Design a protein around this ligand. Structure first.
Ligand SMILES: *Cc1cc2c(nc3c(=O)[nH]c(=O)nc-3n2C[C@H](O)[C@H](O)[C@H](O)COP(=O)(O)OP(=O)(O)OC[C@H]2O[C@@H](n3cnc4c(N)ncnc43)[C@H](O)[C@@H]2O)c(*)c1C
Ligand SMILES: *Cc1cc2c(nc3c(=O)[nH]c(=O)nc-3n2C[C@H](O)[C@H](O)[C@H](O)COP(=O)(O)OP(=O)(O)OC[C@H]2O[C@@H](n3cnc4c(N)ncnc43)[C@H](O)[C@@H]2O)c(*)c1C
Ligand SMILES: CC1=C[C@H](O)[C@H]2O[C@]1(C)O[C@H]([C@H](C)/C=C(C)/C=C/C(O)=C1\C(=O)CNC1=O)[C@H]2C
Ligand SMILES: CC1=C[C@H](O)[C@H]2O[C@]1(C)O[C@H]([C@H](C)/C=C(C)/C=C/C(O)=C1\C(=O)CNC1=O)[C@H]2C
Ligand SMILES: [Cl-]
Ligand SMILES: [Cl-]
Ligand SMILES: [Cl-]
Ligand SMILES: [Cl-]
Ligand SMILES: [Cl-]
Ligand SMILES: [Mg+2]
Ligand SMILES: [Mg+2]
Lengths: 497, 493
């Protein structure tokens, strides 16, 4: 029974993704099992004038799928296969495959991986389309740097749906559709059924073991914690400055430090502690000494000795450690905002962070600003080659608040909005590209970047996410979704006519 | 070929271990088997060469059964991870490599049903079902083995050939005895399970239980600061009395599950998680009745937080699922409780959880709700022989430093021995305790230094099921190919 309507025991679960702020009201949720099922659902919906959306992993930070207008959901749960497609010479990942399944299959069967996200529950469907990256991206780039081809169901001007395959081959007639899938974002062009991935290096023999990167066999994992109790602004500032300068220096595509990843968590002082998690390739005989060099750089002159715990773990095991994977808790309510950083925070922004993290004004105790190591081999790719236009940044910066009370959304949304606006005040409240920031990342969507009350930079949401990729995305949208069947706040949208 | 992993392979460091970092295996080969015939070939070759084998499905074994340095060949079931409805057999097929998270997501999203198996999503079906798996839905629906209709098993015969058999719940099935041993007999004992088939003993959405559509989940936390021994005792007694009264198979409270964590006082707080079917209009009032009973007269006001969630989402909330952290190192011990702790035992717990003679924030005694519909099944109908208990009690210590095992193992050994001191330091069946659960294995139950009860490890885990398990063992693994500490073994000859 592949349709799910209100009253079905499965409806409460399947009307929602993993973000509990958003409750969808679809008349039907179809657990589709093939391209031909997809074309059937889509043609019927479009002929009937009913708004659609696709869910794969359900990790959307915004209401793109659960939007109250959506009448028909295609849930990709039954399309979760991962394997090696011999007839194409590439690995096939169905849109509903979670990253935990992708990594366990690729690694235990073939000893390879993709430099995708940290959370194992994330789905391929939304993740790859949006420019997925994670712990191994400094070493191996974005997951879209391995996208060889995609199979997507698109809707004609007429309203009927059809299946097409689009590839990286420059002569492929649907090549621009392939390109839009290398960061163009979910819910914009059509329903991805499966992605085909392999290295784009030309010299490589046609063997699965050789067609995607080997991860390090073992890694060093460190946890470092500084108590907040003895920590003044000057100490907080030196720590952020140290960390920022180190990433400014050691993030180039040819840096030996491409094999290091870290997340520095600037937590609310109510939490008791600031913390950092670091992962280093443990292969080379000097790995421990190098890890200590980074850790000593971050703490240098801070005046607060951190607690530090380092363990060596075999690689696949390390991917499920919550220190890297996150804690798995998708209950409660969260608001995410984010930005690219080309350079580290200036002293005035650090002052804003310290005030906002120590203020008793609010008591958002779960609030955090996380600085995620980025760049390295991501930045070897020309900015125009894929739809991930940010190819010279050093960090992704994620601002988070979480809470429990369903009646208290406004105070929590306000806190994070004020914090982000204030950090980015001098560029109209938003991370404007091409300066200290490089705009925003579409898999951390934030409707506020299109809101005139929060964005006073004169730069539209579409340029913050996509920079100069946007006009090429709009040309793909005009060709491939002429009816604008696939849309949401922050969806690629052709120019007004 | 790619499917055999040897030392030096990039995969070898991961695949030589389970999820238990205390145990590092030294297998010459790990075979990622893809079929019954591949398993047969691994086995028949190993038997001819005299090489010890072991199977790994989800890797969650709490003991060294799979990673024992003597194991030369491992069969890893990762590639056999499918879950679906088998139309030809009229039953749900769960391959041994399937994790519980995959089982639950597939059974629920595609068919609207579930199995009352364990809380952790990363556990494999392979070892879990064979050992008598239970979890949050067991008071409402029994043990997962109460839905075991059939099993496909690769066995080794006297001649040394491996072969594949199907054993079913039907009394006239010539392999029925083998089927029976899979309803609780434990992994690594009889042969290699390729797949289980499951359905209600009594159209796919009708063939297994439907879970509640929504549940209430509560977290209750009592600060340890100014919790004295009287208040700690009162809370434990209250909880114990409630479970002694409300754990019958016909109890309306078969739809409540909870874990009460008696933590080290260094941790800051005692805590309890509770899940209640939310479908009745009076669920919130029923939950409040339970919670007020546990806290009555304690003198410490808990912090309490209740949320209503859709069922599948609930199964991934770490308050129920656990935190997913299988790094560091852990020692588990466990017991069935037919009745709640007496005075001496509550006193021992309090002293050992507050002692500074010892220092480790991570030690806990978890009291897990049990019984209800588990107890509607006669004690001899499956290989799960404990069918009148009210709780499972789990003793745990965890640590980071791989050079500090002795002090942690000593701490937990001494706590468990002291709790069970009146019966030889072990939970002897048929009194306040009912023995032990083979999915929480503990080799100390076979060690004369820790078990002075006169009752052997086999009777603690299996009670009167053991002779029948030995007859199964003699018939189906005459060469004793499948063995480990605490494995089923025929009488001395
Ligand atoms: C919840 C969560 C998200 C994370 C986590 N960690 C990440 C990391 O380390 N690196 C990252 O780059 N991203 C991380 N993310 C974010 C995820 O990358 C985004 O949340 C993804 O967009 C989520 O993908 P998915 O789980 O599939 O989410 P959905 O909500 O189903 O879809 C998102 C968006 O894309 C559309 N879409 C889904 N499926 C399709 C298909 N098949 N075709 C076209 N479009 C699709 C949806 O309609 C929606 O618009 C860690 C955590 C814990
Ligand atoms: C780590 C972990 C364990 C849990 C968790 N939660 C549980 C719960 O809520 N209820 C429970 O009933 N049990 C819980 N457990 C314990 C697990 O039930 C046991 O740890 C299982 O035995 C684990 O099974 P599996 O993950 O497959 O572990 P393995 O280490 O691969 O095997 C254990 C044992 O069984 C043999 N074996 C495995 N596979 C087979 C096959 N196919 N055929 C025969 N025998 C097999 C192994 O050789 C070994 O002897 C929550 C968490 C976090
Ligand atoms: C390293 C990560 C990369 C991924 O891009 C995501 O994953 C990791 C583990 O961390 C990132 C960020 C710091 C953390 C967030 C948003 C935390 C969210 C959070 O606590 C919750 C929710 O989202 C819902 N309930 C909750 O409690 C997040 C964007
Ligand atoms: C409710 C559960 C039932 C399951 O039967 C198991 O799961 C649940 C969630 O909890 C049980 C128990 C209280 C907790 C344990 C053993 C904790 C283990 C633990 O912290 C660790 C490890 O095992 C390894 N490293 C670690 O840090 C455990 C036996
Ligand atoms: Cl298809
Ligand atoms: Cl939207
Ligand atoms: Cl053993
Ligand atoms: Cl039957
Ligand atoms: Cl708990
Ligand atoms: Mg959280
Ligand atoms: Mg733990």
């Amino acid at each position: 029974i592949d349709s799910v309507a209100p009253g079905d025991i499965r409806y409460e679960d399947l009307r929602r993704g993993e973000n509990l702020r958003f409750v969808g009201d679809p008349e039907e949720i179809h657990l589709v099992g093939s391209a031909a099922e997809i074309e059937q659902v889509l043609s019927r919906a479009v002929r009937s004038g009913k708004r659609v959306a696709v869910r794969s992993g359900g990790h959307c930070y915004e209401d793109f799928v659960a939007n109250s207008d959506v009448r028909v959901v295609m849930d990709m749960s039954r399309l979760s296969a991962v394997g090696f497609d011999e007839e194409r010479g590439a690995f096939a990942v169905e849109a509903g495959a979670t990253l935990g399944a992708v990594y366990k299959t690729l690694f235990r069967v073939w000893g390879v991986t993709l430099p995708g996200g940290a959370c194992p529950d994330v789905g391929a469907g939304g993740h790859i389309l949006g420019g997925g990256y994670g712990p191994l991206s400094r070493m191996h780039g974005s997951i879209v740097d391995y996208l060889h081809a995609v199979e997507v169901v698109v809707v004609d001007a007429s309203g009927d749906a059809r299946t097409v395959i689009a590839t990286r081959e420059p002569s492929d007639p649907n090549h621009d559709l392939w390109w839009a899938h290398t960061g163009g974002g979910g819910g914009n062009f059509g329903v991805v059924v499966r992605y085909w991935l392999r290295t784009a290096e030309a010299d490589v023999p046609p063997e699965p073991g050789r067609l995607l990167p080997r991860p390090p066999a073992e890694v060093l994992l460190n946890t470092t914690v500084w108590p907040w109790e003895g920590l003044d602004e000057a100490a907080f500032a030196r720590l952020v400055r140290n960390h920022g300068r180190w990433f400014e220096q050691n993030s180039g595509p040819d840096s030996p430090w491409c094999d290091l990843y870290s997340v520095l968590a600037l937590t609310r002082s109510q939490s008791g502690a600031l913390a950092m998690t670091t992962q280093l390739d443990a292969t080379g005989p000097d790995a421990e000494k190098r890890l200590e060099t980074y850790l000593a750089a971050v703490s240098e002159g801070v005046g607060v000795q951190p607690h530090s715990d380092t363990r060596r773990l075999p690689w696949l095991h390390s991917t499920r450690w919550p220190g890297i994977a996150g804690d798995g808790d998708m209950t409660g309510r969260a608001k995410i905002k984010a930005a690219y950083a080309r350079r580290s925070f200036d002293d005035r922004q650090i002052g804003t962070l310290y005030t906002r993290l120590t203020s008793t004004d609010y008591d958002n105790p779960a609030g955090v600003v996380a600085l995620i190591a980025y760049g390295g081999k991501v930045n070897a790719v020309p900015a125009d080659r894929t739809a991930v236009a940010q190819r010279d940044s050093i960090l992704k910066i994620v601002y988070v608040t979480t809470w429990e009370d369903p009646a208290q959304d406004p105070v929590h949304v306000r806190w994070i909005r004020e914090l982000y606006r204030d950090v980015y005040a001098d560029t109209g409240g938003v991370p404007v590209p091409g300066g200290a920031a490089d705009g925003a990342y579409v898999n951390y969507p934030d409707v506020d970047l299109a809101d005139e009350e929060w964005n006073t930079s004169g730069v539209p949401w579409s340029e913050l996410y996509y920079k100069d990729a946007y006009p090429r995305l709009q040309a793909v949208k005009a060709r491939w979704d002429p009816r604008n069947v696939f849309r949401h706040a922050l969806s690629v949208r052709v120019p007004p006519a």
